[PDB]
Amino acid sequence: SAQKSPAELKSIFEKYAAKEGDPNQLSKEELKQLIQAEFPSLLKGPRTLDDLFQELDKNGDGEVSFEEFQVLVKKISQ
Numbered sequence: 001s002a003q004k005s006p007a008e009l010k011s012i013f014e015k016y017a018a019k020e021g022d023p024n025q026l027s028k029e030e031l032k033q034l035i036q037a038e039f040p041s042l043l044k045g046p047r048t049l050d051d052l053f054q055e056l057d058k059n060g061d062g063e064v065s066f067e068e069f070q071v072l073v074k075k076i077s078q
Contacts, residue, residue, distance in 0.1 A: 003077040004038060012037070013069060020062045026069070027062030028053065038076050046075060 001008070016030045017023045026034060031053055035041075041049055052075065056068035064072065 004073075005077075006073065009038075009073050009076060010066075013066065013073075017062065017066070022061035025058065025060055025062040025065040028057075030062060031064050031072075046078070 012034065013026065014023060016026045016034055019030060020027055035049060043049065052072055053064065056064045056071055058065050058068055
């Protein structure tokens with residue numbers, strides 16, 4: 001919603017990750033889109049669009065795993 005619920009983000013995340021072979025991560029392209037969807041760079045404070053990606057930039061099939069993504073999630077709602 002205005003604030004993003006864990007279940008909500010989880011559902012969206014699954015929806016995104018399922019676009020790639022492994023429904024467990026989102027590749028750079030997908031993560032970027034997610035960012036755009038949740039808050040299109042209106043980060044008037046925590047300016048990091050990419051620092052957070054890099055800090056979590058794994059690469060199994062896509063990029064950022066659900067495991068790592070949870071750290072991202074924590075900063076969505078604020």
